[PDB]
Amino acid sequence: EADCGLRPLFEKKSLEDKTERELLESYI
Amino acid sequence: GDFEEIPEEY
Amino acid sequence: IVEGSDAEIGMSPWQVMLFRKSPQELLCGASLISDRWVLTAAHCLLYPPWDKNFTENDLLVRIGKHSRTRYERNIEKISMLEKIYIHPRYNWRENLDRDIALMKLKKPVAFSDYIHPVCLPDRETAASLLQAGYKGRVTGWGNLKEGQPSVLQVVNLPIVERPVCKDSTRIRITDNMFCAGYKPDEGKRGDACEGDSGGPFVMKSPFNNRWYQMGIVSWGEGCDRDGKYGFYTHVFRLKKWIQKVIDQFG
Ligand code: NA
Ligand code: NA
């Protein structure tokens, strides 16, 4: 909850999912 | 129906 | 979800499945916002034109799921509802304005690698991120075309300028809604669809690398039609009601 929005298998291990970069690239 | 049955406990 | 992809494992650990006890069937999507609160669309629970009015006892929440139909032993958790809370100005008569509801679980759910809450936006994140062209992600076990998937589906969609949203439909759209999707000319496509209802539209903040729930799958005309866009409940706009519910009945 204070840890909201950080996924155990991605953000917390510093792994990226296969298409999250597409979101980033849109934040123009 | 298409669904696997969940434990009766639920 | 149409023209989406299979989710990765643990990619959407806030994804919730709203499940009917009898006959056991998917009802809707939903999302985990704390260890005891689930967010969904009001129309998932109340929709008089179709004789829909579910009570607590009719439903279960299934969290940490991946497979639509299988019971995911040792992974998913299945929770009971203590109480349902529907927006008191939810407009089911005309346009699904304020299409939002809260569900309080009987017992706190245990977080795991597959079960984790999403954040709700503050005004500055909302202002920074809810911009035409910025993409969000929508997830669901809904139909694949205007027929169901084996696992959770995912699709990334750009937020659409309000004038284009309005000009795409005859429905009256409000400030409590936003629309997302590709235009006919952009080439690519994808949409939410029936069964994706109440599921989250999320964005990853580039400021602090956390996932925020900006919308709720609410409505559309067909699914993935050229010239049409999916409509989403504007979570930040109804934030005050959310806090209030969780403060009062927390
Ligand atoms: Na219009
Ligand atoms: Na479309």
DSSP string, C205-216: -TTT--EEEEEE
Residues of chain A with Cβ-Cβ distance to C209 below 8 Å are: 6, 11
Query: Which domains, from first to last, does chain C contain?
Result: 1-12+118-236 (2.40.10.10), 13-117+237-250 (2.40.10.10)
User: Is C43 a known active-site residue?
Assistant: yes
- Catalytic residue, candidates C12, C31, C43, C191: C43
Task: Name the experiment that determined this structure.
Answer: X-ray
H or E stretch at C17: strand C15-20
Q: Which long-range contacts (CB under 8 A, 24 or more apart) does C219-222 make?
A: C219/C43, C219/C96, C219/C99, C220/C191, C220/C192, C220/C193, C221/C169, C222/C146
Asked if A6's CB is within 8 angstroms of C204's CB, the reply is no
- Widest Cα–Cα separation across chain A: 28
Neighbour count for residue B3 (Cβ, 10 Å) = 16
* Nearest residue in chain C measured CA to CA from B10: C78
C176 and C215 Cβ atoms separated by less than 8 Å:
no
Burial class (CB in 10 A: 0-12, 13-18, 19+), C166: middle
**CA atoms of C79 and C82, how far apart (whole Å):** 10
CATH class of the region A1-28 = few secondary structures
H helices present in chain C, as ranges: 123-129, 162-167, 239-249
Q: How far apart are CA C87 and CA C242, in angstroms?
A: 9
Residues of chain A neighbouring C205 (CB-CB closer than 8 A): 5
> Where are the alpha helices (H) located in A1-28, listed in sequence order?
20-26
Structure's resolution in angstroms: 1.9
The chain C residue lying nearest B4, using CA atoms, is: C70
Amino acid letter, B8: E
Query: What is the residue whose two structure tokens read 């992809």?
Result: C5
What CA dihedral angle connects C141, C100, A27 and C17, to 10 degrees?
-20
- What is the nearest CA distance from C27 to chain B, expressed in angstroms? 12
Which ligand is the nearest neighbour of the Cα of C231? 2
Task: Quote the tokens at residue C184.
Answer: 């006919």
DSSP-derived secondary structure for C104-154 = EESSPPPP-SS--PPBPPPHHHHHHH--TT-EEEEEES--S-----SB-EE
